[PDB]
Amino acid sequence: LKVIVGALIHSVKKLADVTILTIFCLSVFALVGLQLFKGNLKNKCVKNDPDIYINKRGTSDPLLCGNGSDSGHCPDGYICLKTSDNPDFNYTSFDSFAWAFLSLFRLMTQDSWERLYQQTLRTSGKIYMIFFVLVIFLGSFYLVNLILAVVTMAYEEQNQATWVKLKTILFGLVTDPFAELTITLCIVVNTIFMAMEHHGMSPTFEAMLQIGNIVFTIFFTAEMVFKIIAFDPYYYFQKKWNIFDCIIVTVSLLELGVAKKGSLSVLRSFRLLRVFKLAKSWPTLNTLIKIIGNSVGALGNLTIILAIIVFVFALVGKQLLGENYRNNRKNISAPHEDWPRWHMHDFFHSFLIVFRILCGEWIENMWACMEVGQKSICLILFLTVMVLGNLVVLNLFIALLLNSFSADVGWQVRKTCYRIVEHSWFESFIIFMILLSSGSLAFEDYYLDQKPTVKALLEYTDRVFTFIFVFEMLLKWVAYGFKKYFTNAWCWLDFLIVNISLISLTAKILEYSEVAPIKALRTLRALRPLRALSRFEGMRVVVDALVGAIPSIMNVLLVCLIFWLIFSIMGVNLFAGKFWRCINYTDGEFSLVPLSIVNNKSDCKIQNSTGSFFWVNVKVNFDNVAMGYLALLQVATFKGWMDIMYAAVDSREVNMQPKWEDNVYMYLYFVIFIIFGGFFTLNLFVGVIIDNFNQQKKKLGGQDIFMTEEQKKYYNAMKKLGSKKPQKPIPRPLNKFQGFVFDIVTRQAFDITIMVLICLNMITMMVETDDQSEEKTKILGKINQFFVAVFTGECVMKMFALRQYYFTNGWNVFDFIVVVLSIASLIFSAILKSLQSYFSPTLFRVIRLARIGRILRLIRAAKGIRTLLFALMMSLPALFNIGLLLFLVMFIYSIFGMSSFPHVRWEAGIDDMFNFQTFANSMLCLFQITTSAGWDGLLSPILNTGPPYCDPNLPNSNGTRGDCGSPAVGIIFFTTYIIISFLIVVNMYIAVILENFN
Ligand SMILES: *[C@@H]1O[C@H](CO)[C@@H](O[C@@H]2O[C@H](CO)[C@@H](O[C@@H]3O[C@H](CO)[C@@H](O)[C@H](O)[C@@H]3O)[C@H](O)[C@H]2NC(C)=O)[C@H](O)[C@H]1NC(C)=O
Ligand SMILES: CCCCCCCCCCCCCCCCCCOC[C@@H](O)COP(=O)(O)OCC[N+](C)(C)C
Ligand SMILES: CC(C)CCC[C@@H](C)[C@H]1CC[C@H]2[C@@H]3CC=C4C[C@@H](O)CC[C@]4(C)[C@H]3CC[C@]12C
Ligand SMILES: CC(C)CCC[C@@H](C)[C@H]1CC[C@H]2[C@@H]3CC=C4C[C@@H](O)CC[C@]4(C)[C@H]3CC[C@]12C
Ligand SMILES: CC(C)CCC[C@@H](C)[C@H]1CC[C@H]2[C@@H]3CC=C4C[C@@H](O)CC[C@]4(C)[C@H]3CC[C@]12C
């Protein structure tokens, strides 16, 4: 309505600066991509002596090539020509500016950016990960922070603007506080009783569990009867807690009366909502329930707005694409499924599509839509859903976030070592030694076997490092008292790490050097580079800030763990052991045998003529509550989410072959789990951390946290450099000719002319295209010469108009640097094109990029972009500390992975490039998952258990008998990685937000 359009106009006015920054930064990075990797994602592997392309293991699209020393290779008998198609429906390469903009929008929204990351590093070269790191940090974090801050401030400004019965009663009225404690004990034990539901529970276990359920239903019924007789029912009403318990008990007894095995497992688990009764001695659970209530209560208007928006988008998508999806389904349909797992044909699946968009995965369905129907309709619909969809969601996540959180010889002997240790020389020696030790544990990799000298040198240096660190601890002991030394947290960590190293080294010589405990002990050497958190003041202050919030993290962690236990129990009840299928694993790719041939384990055993019918289960299932937790986490991070939705919907009943969309309506379980365990237990984690820092800062004096004392004054000086200090220039300097040029320069024409010159040098290098004609190349290359000459001449006339001692007058030094860079690029291109033109052709495009300075020159004109960049400049030291810590933890887990998974089957997620064998590869993978992208894909080849998936008979990997994973450690590793990184990055968002708040 008119009110809505007026509010939108006001918001865009408030969103103008951030929108302009987004468009400009996206354009700059699009130009960088279009001038770096245009025409690289076309190197389909092809045969040589013809026109058929190999496929990547378990893939339908062709493999990709690159000639770079560190790009994707190709199998023998194949050659790497370029082909007119791009890997993913001819839509995932940025050669034209349109594709560059789209791919950089994908990188910003971090939606399936894993795919582009792997493709581009496979076709271009591993060294280009720098572009993706830079774009992820700048814009995927930066621009999201700024847009979320803008909406925050918009909301803030909106707020600113706006007798046997007598004996029974006597016995019953006790209501002693010991009765409630017994009830709570009975709830807890009942829950932990039902938390032993597993697929292969024996009949005795089933009997025991149903007996327990009967006992507890009886006990609840008896307590309800006591309560109703304790006082007359007329007063029982007006008690929400009591009526909730009444309804749940009624459902429990109704299910008990049911004699069909509790066919509705949902009803079976309806009792489990009792844990909410436990929200009386816990304040965090009460706050969570209050969050949900405000969502459904005071702030229900926004929620209904979100629901109506999603319903409208789903219905429109169906009405406009169902028939096309049905007719051309074969186009997007899997090779064997004969159908698209997602489509618009039915309201349910259109809603699921819209929900996946809101979840933040849009490109897959985007390609499907825009290769099955009109491009215009798909283009507008998917993008308009992304913007409006994720805008409304973030409005909830904050509106709820604020609503809920607005309320003697010995003396001299000791002094000897004391003054020795205090020596700055020794302090620097030790810090450098720690850094060298951290570096040393990086080349111990899968390939270290083939270089005997390197490993011998590495073990020698580790031994010497152990000895020197033992000496250092001896000096520490001598200098400081035992009590003082042991009462220090950091001293404890340095004690444990040296203990681990010493015991590992002793075990090297001693026996028992192969058992699993000692193997794990030596695996813990990856904590060795954790000694550098006290040495560095930035890391130390960050660690103190984090440890300050440990209790506030733990409270919400436990509340969320209980909520996830509830959901895992429901999931186990619903899908205990139905995630089993008979497959066709002949060589590499596999397919579910059709129901015609095999219908159940019996068939899969008798129809096994070829020997290629295996009966195996999904990697992550709902057998146990542990696997319930793991699968719930995968659905919560939105990675691996799909393989489980597929298995859940397909499964029919124990020991039966899954059928396509048998239980098509079991998507609702995952929709509900997201909506409740993913978004409502994150509005409670954020809230707690912001209410923790809001106070912790207030307590420490309100001084900016994360910044060392030394850097505090450097930041003070910088913000002092960001002040108001203008000097009036001198007219007609020196000779009148200088005055003549100066008077015209002063006018408000030179600025605008250079600016419109910089815009026409942007739109002359954006019109470039990979398949451009040679005449087009000629004209644009000459326009480039004209522009560089114009800029150099118009930069040297102003220079003369201001003598030669005006470098420090202002930002003109940047203009001088960029113009000299452009001239240098011109001359170097001229040299290479003729003199020594035999170098690699990549350098031509690398250097040709140096013309981006003429784009960076537009900053000084844009006040909003300049202010936001200044905010980044101010935040840079704190972000440097946090990034140091994050790279440190990334290093720790890099060494862990390098030691753990150097032998694994290269299933979807792990291939030759993105394995864990090399340090750089492992670093690539860990950086990938730091954003929580593709961690499921990297996890799947670790859950492999025996054939057919893995080959535990393989000669290699003596630890596991073959290239089979170890899920016990593989789940801990990735769960801890995606939790720790979330913490660090959520403290990196807080820092940026508080800096921009100043
Ligand atoms: C797995 O599913 C298949 C398909 O539903 C089941 O196949 C059917 O099983 C029944 C019972 O064994 C068979 O019935 C008998 O068939 C013989 C002839 O083969 C007939 O002489 C008997 O009077 C009786 O009708 C039925 O034929 C069979 N159908 C097919 C197509 O094979 C199978 O039993 C299931 N396995 C298990 C263990 O549940
Ligand atoms: C090495 C094992 C691997 C995992 C290590 C943990 C991961 C690294 C990050 C966490 C570091 C944990 C240790 C540092 C904790 C913060 C530091 C906690 O403060 C304790 C002392 O450092 C302070 O000095 P004192 O205790 O001697 O005197 C003050 C007395 N009060 C005030 C404490 C009572
Ligand atoms: C596997 C074995 C060797 C691990 C032993 C680790 C123990 C001894 C360490 C790990 C972390 C340590 C704590 C870290 C921080 C502090 C605060 C400070 O006031 C000293 C005591 C106290 C509370 C430490 C006590 C000892 C402690 C709990
Ligand atoms: C200066 C003229 C073009 C009018 C103003 C529009 C300018 C600023 C920009 C806006 C969007 C731009 C287009 C966006 C993308 C592409 C695809 C690329 O492969 C060739 C150039 C082309 C087609 C651009 C031409 C210039 C363009 C039209
Ligand atoms: C409303 C203002 C005036 C008060 C302060 C509120 C601050 C603390 C709020 C408003 C915006 C919030 C952010 C919104 C979204 C995200 C992204 C999420 O992945 C982690 C939490 C994080 C980074 C939030 C942290 C807390 C936050 C910065």
Curated annotation (Swiss-Prot):
Extent of the IV repeats: 730-998
Effect of C795Y: No gain in function in response to depolarization
Keyword flag Transport: yes
Entry superkingdom: Eukaryota
Quaternary state and interactors: The channel consists of an ion conducting pore forming alpha-subunit regulated by one or more associated auxiliary subunits SCN1B, SCN2B and SCN3B; electrophysiological properties may vary depending on the type of the associated beta subunits. Found in a number of complexes with PRX, DYNLT1 and PDZD2. Interacts with proteins such as FSTL1, PRX, DYNLT1, PDZD2, S100A10 and many others. Interacts with NEDD4 and NEDD4L.
Function (record text): Tetrodotoxin-resistant channel that mediates the voltage-dependent sodium ion permeability of excitable membranes. Assuming opened or closed conformations in response to the voltage difference across the membrane, the protein forms a sodium-selective channel through which sodium ions may pass in accordance with their electrochemical gradient. Plays a role in neuropathic pain mechanisms.
Free-text domain note: The sequence contains 4 internal repeats, each with 5 hydrophobic segments (S1, S2, S3, S5, S6) and one positively charged segment (S4). Segments S4 are probably the voltage-sensors and are characterized by a series of positively charged amino acids at every third position.
Protein name: Sodium channel protein type 10 subunit alpha
The organism of origin for this protein: Homo sapiens (Human)
